[model samples]
Target chain A: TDEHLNPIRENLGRQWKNCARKLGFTESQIDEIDHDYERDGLKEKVYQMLQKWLMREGTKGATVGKLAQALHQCCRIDLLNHLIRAS
Target chain B: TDEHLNPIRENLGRQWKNCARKLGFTESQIDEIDHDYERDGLKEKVYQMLQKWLMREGTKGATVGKLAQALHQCCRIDLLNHLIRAS
Candidate 1:
């Protein structure tokens, strides 16, 4: 599933943080993510953030619409379009 | 979209007065939904309560968890299973 979503996750950029916030990650959780994924690149870290959400949400709980909606919330309509294509 | 996403709006029907309060909707806004949708029956009125929330949060941030939390705070977990069991 990581690679299944890799295309969208790859281009997330620094704006990924905003999506994390909108997707309901807490202040402490984001802080923790920064530290835990400290060795990874910005893009990989972005995927890790989503990875965190997937497990936290029990995989099924946080649906694709959640990601698509979060992308729109944080103004990543570019990748939002990609998600629709993949769907 | 309206009917299926929230099968729990019924019992929350009358008590959503308090449910919105827990979701941090201002008293004035609550009255806004209360008065604006006043022409409808209780069922539609309840659905409108959620409609306003869906619009306010871009239909994303006012998540199932928020509804479950509001329902729990309202002592209406009798409906909470709708989200939990579906997962």
Candidate 2:
């Protein structure tokens, strides 16, 4: 029981710490983002900026696989491209 | 009757063929998606499904960057999660 308990807590703590790291602006920054989320509900501001940066700065010939490999981000590049082209 | 002309046409033909293959059902299936695009315009139906699959079946606790690399998708996982959490 004790051994299982420790790992669970350890893993949860690790996850929380990661969330903290990702916010990149401390807990207070998170609070602000939360407020914005409450108001506008997770606007695409950040996502749009990311797309812009990648399209402009990322390797021109890079495949979706390469982009995912390099950036470790979670986008379905092929499907997204397919969707874009389909659109 | 020139070498350069043939290469240009060849490249264009190759690109067109690949496009045909990816539309995945047919040039006609594309018409449905395109009409949807013209109306709703690139709905996230396909993309969302892909994300759901990845999150559900992918290596648990994998980083977004790694997920992107794994799926070679365009979504910025960190930003997407940040927004999700922010929401």
Candidate 3:
């Protein structure tokens, strides 16, 4: 298996890490969240956890991962509380 | 006319119309919505208008057009109320 060609997994991890940062986590926190998602073996749980954390962080208006991705893109933190909700 | 960048426009229109439908809008409503965006010369206004309409229709859980496109994908209507709201 080629290493450099594994862009998909690498990109997924990269993007997950990016999302973690936007959700108000530091690089280490992102590593932990990514580790939880990747190694702790709780993908959906991690997703849910992040979702809740994002919601509580005032990102409930952000109902899409793209919005989070965009936040990461723009570095805008004002709309943090208006993201998605589970219900 | 290249008729190729046209793909972007066509797809955007198709996606927009599809989002209009999932918000519980009729074909005419979708047309009107698209018309408001295209012919009526109110692109952002159309997005704002649809955002509110989708919000009122219980699609408040939606925040992006892709999800609405996905709703068009799976035909789900419950989360049709959640979308990007202008605050």
Candidate 4:
């Protein structure tokens, strides 16, 4: 099981960077997000940032599609589905 | 752009369900997560749940790989990468 999980873990690193780049998130922004946790080991802060982004545009009208696009690019299909199905 | 986003959006729905199934998450559990938001439109609650899960196992042991497996199954490769690289 650990063997199977290893490849997924390794591949995800590249996938995330690529997805973030395609989604138009700058490297500095990505670095900041990563740095915030390293600086203080505060997991809550990262969660808050992600939650704020998810809820910001509001799941109504065209904004819903925009949010979906971000989630898709980030490979968070589960959250994207939750938003779409819940909406 | 809208057209491109549309196909990704549609494909993600199926991907999410399939991933959840593969991860052994019951449909009812998925429904509850979706239903909670539908009931009150409270996105914060969902985020809290996700954050709690992410922080629970502690990213220092074998559990890190376990969490990665879950995220990979859920197609949250971005979060998986963040967790791995952060640790």
lDDT of each: 0.70, 0.34, 0.43, 0.45
Interface RMSD of each: 8.7, 7.3, 9.6, 12.8
Q: What is the C-alpha lDDT profile of model 4 across A8-82, one tens digit per residue?
A: 222233234444454455788667655665433233233434444444434452254664576576775564465
Q: DockQ: which is higher, 2 or 3?
A: 2
TM-score of each predicted structure versus truth: 0.46, 0.21, 0.26, 0.31
Candidate that scores best on TM-score: 1
Please, what are the lDDT tens digits per residue for candidate 1 over residues B1-87?
545455666555556777678767899988887888778767876777777777888756767777766655654555555445754
Instruction: Give candidates' CA RMSD values in order.
Output: 14.8, 20.3, 16.2, 19.8
**What lDDT is obtained when candidate 1 is compared to the true structure?**
0.70
Q: Which is superior by TM-score, 1 or 4?
A: 1
Error of 2 at B39 (Å): 30
Tell me the tens digit of each residue's lDDT in model 4 across B1-87.
233222223333434545445444444444434433444444433443344343443455325456457657677666446434654
Q: What's the distance in Å from true for residue A30, model 2?
A: 1.4
- Candidate 3 structure lDDT: 0.43
Residue A23's lDDT within candidate 4 is 47
Candidate 1 per-residue lDDT over residues A1-87, each given as its tens digit: 555467667777888679889889888878877887788778767887876666455435556777778878889878858555756
Q: What DockQ does every candidate get? A: 0.02, 0.03, 0.02, 0.03
**lDDT measured at residue B47 in model 3 versus the true structure, 0 to 100:** 56
TM-score of chain A of each: 0.82, 0.27, 0.37, 0.46
Sorted by TM-score (best first), the order is 1, 4, 3, 2
TM-score, model 2 to reference: 0.21
